């Protein structure tokens, strides 16, 4: 009644909202690694690089609690791209590369994808599809000195711009034009590096800032860095909610014969949906199959005649849901009959249903009609001795309601 937006229901079969088996349990499988990542040897380090020669630290084979970073008051900026910091505690990565340097407070805005200028072009280039976080903080109380702290440098000149994560410590004199430089300064011939000379009296844009950029090796490759999370027992042949290394899903996990080559962690379907995985603790290949689903059709005589009702769970097997299995699906509330009749309401795969004798909804294999051996022989004919005039009505559509929509008044009112 609600599906039809109606108080009457006519005789028929009506697809109401679909059936899904619900996940019985929620499961998690991360690697069984025990180290904790050395982030103190980055964010609490005594020294940070000159930006022309930024450091890189590989983080691997360890638990990473990113909430120790984003819960801390210590950081003045924490932009994240392709991720939110809150979600990093639930993810897993093959490696993470922590890139670090000192810059003046104005230059922090060049440390992003899509940027251009002396830092972005001559010192440190991010890829435009960088998935990662940029963490930065003021250090004028640590990295600044009376008469100036000159110990931090940047590259003011290069003959060509950096590609993503391209690094270059070359000291060569920058030749700006026709003047022959040959490793000494002059007009059109300039040394490529300059100091910030940080003094405590500097305005905020000229104060020293420390920067860490976290770059995630987020791939189909196996993980080695993972968020702080418990791992569960593994369940098979039963529909579960699941998580393997941060790949969330819902399905029937099974053992499988898929011959993964040793470097492969996942297998993908035509849609790019993962349809096999390797467990990261014990290296079995599990097939992933969708949790069972199908239409729910309601089979009814019209409300003008009865209010008893039958239901078809299309394609479903009755173990997954009177109850009666058919090729069309699990059929509920219908009386399975051994007789056969003409087809009232068509169920599918040769099955039909009707309301019959004290009455109930029956379901049966449909009758194609009476069977008839025509009395043929090489010398037998039948000739009809009398007739009937039939007047069989036929109805045909010829037109439909002429409509016009002023789409300007419809769209824009």
């Amino acid at each position: 009644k609600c599906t039809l937006k109606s108080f009457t229901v006519e005789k028929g079969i009506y697809q109401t909202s679909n059936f899904r088996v619900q996940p019985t349990e929620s499961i998690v499988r991360f690697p069984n690694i025990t180290n904790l990542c050395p982030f103190g040897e980055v964010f609490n380090a005594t020294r940070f690089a000159s930006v022309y020669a930024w450091n890189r630290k590989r983080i691997s084979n360890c638990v990473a609690d990113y909430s120790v970073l984003y819960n801390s008051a210590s950081f003045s900026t924490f932009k994240c791209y392709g991720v939110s910091p809150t979600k990093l505690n639930d993810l897993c990565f093959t490696n993470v590369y922590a890139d670090s340097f000192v810059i003046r407070g104005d230059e922090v805005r060049q440390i992003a994808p899509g940027q251009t200028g002396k830092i972005a072009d001559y010192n440190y280039k991010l890829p435009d599809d960088f998935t990662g976080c940029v963490i930065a903080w003021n250090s004028n109380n640590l990295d600044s000195k009376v008469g100036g702290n000159y110990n931090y440098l940047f590259r003011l000149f290069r003959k060509s711009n950096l590609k993503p994560f391209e690094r270059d410590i070359s000291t060569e004199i920058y030749q700006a034009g026709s003047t022959p430089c040959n490793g000494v300064e002059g007009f059109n011939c300039y040394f490529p590096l300059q100091s910030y000379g940080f003094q405590p009296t500097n305005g905020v844009g000229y104060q020293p800032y420390r920067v860490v950029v976290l770059s995630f090796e987020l791939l189909h490759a196996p993980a080695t860095v993972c968020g702080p999370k418990k791992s569960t027992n593994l369940v098979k042949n039963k529909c579960v909610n699941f998580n393997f290394n941060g790949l969330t899903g819902t399905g029937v996990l099974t053992e499988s014969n898929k011959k993964f080559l040793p470097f492969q962690q996942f297998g993908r379907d035509i849609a790019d949906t993962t349809d096999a995985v390797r467990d990261p603790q014990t290296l079995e290949i599990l097939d992933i199959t969708p949790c069972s689903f199908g239409g729910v059709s309601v089979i009814t005589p019209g409300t003008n005649t009865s209010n008893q009702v039958a239901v078809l769970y299309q394609g479903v097997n009755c173990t997954e849901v009177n109850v009666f299995q058919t090729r069309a699906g699990c059929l509920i509330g219908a009386e399975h009959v051994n007789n056969s009749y003409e087809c009232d309401i068509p169920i599918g795969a040769g099955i039909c249903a009707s309301y019959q004798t004290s009455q109930s909804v029956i379901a049966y294999t449909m009758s194609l009609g009476a069977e008839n051996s025509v009395a043929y022989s090489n010398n037998s004919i039948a000739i009809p001795t009398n007739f009937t005039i039939s007047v069989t009505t036929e109805i045909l559509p010829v037109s439909m309601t002429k409509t016009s929509v002023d789409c300007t008044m419809y769209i824009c009112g």
Binding site: A375, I381, T385, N386, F387, S390, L396, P397, Y410
Partner: protein, 198 residues
């Protein structure tokens, strides 16, 4: 129950217009589905973004309606070309086409107007009281094979008669209702009756 063909045309077009009208109430991802509400809550720099979502969704909703009316108009036009062919062949004619103008052998048809359609009252001859007989493809007279000009040879059991195919009317077999072709020996199932000379 018979008029469900025309009542479904009304119901499909009512369902299409009610879907198009109810789709005015959809947000399509805007703050509201009332266009005046957006324009009375927002300044134009903000409102143009929200209105463009309503324009995008109402335009897609109207394109979907017009495309499904084009496909439905092609379906009604096939039925109007069929109704125009039943008008010509069966109202203005008598069709030899099997089951074109009702089941049985077509005699005649009458058009009755109906809402958005036509109803044909197809008058047809149906044979109704079969009887079994013995039959034979030819008759061997003076060593001549005889075949019927029109209709079929049959026997009541002891005497041989010719009838039209579609109504039992036994006629005596004579050289008027039969034609000769060659000697008897060629024919699989010829029978040795007489044929009368008028």
């Amino acid at each position: 129950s018979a008029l469900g063909k025309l009542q479904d045309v009304v119901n499909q077009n009512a369902q299409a217009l009610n879907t198009l009208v109810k789709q005015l109430s959809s947000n399509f991802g805007a703050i509201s589905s009332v266009l005046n509400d957006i324009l009375s809550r927002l300044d134009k720099v903000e409102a143009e973004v929200q209105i463009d979502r309503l324009i995008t969704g109402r335009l897609q909703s109207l394109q979907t309606y017009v495309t499904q009316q084009l496909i439905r108009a092609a379906e009604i036009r096939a039925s109007a070309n069929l109704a125009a062919t039943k008008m010509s062949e069966c109202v203005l004619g008598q069709s030899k086409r099997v089951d074109f103008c009702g089941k049985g052998y077509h005699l005649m048809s009458f058009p009755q107007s109906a809402p958005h359609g036509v109803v044909f009252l197809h008058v047809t001859y149906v044979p109704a009281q079969e009887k079994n007989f013995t039959t034979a493809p030819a008759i061997c007279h003076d060593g001549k094979a005889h075949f019927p000009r029109e209709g079929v040879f049959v026997s009541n059991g002891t005497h041989w008669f010719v009838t039209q195919r579609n109504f039992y009317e036994p006629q005596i077999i004579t050289t008027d209702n039969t034609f000769v072709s060659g000697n008897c020996d060629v024919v699989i199932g010829i029978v040795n009756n007489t044929v009368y000379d008028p």
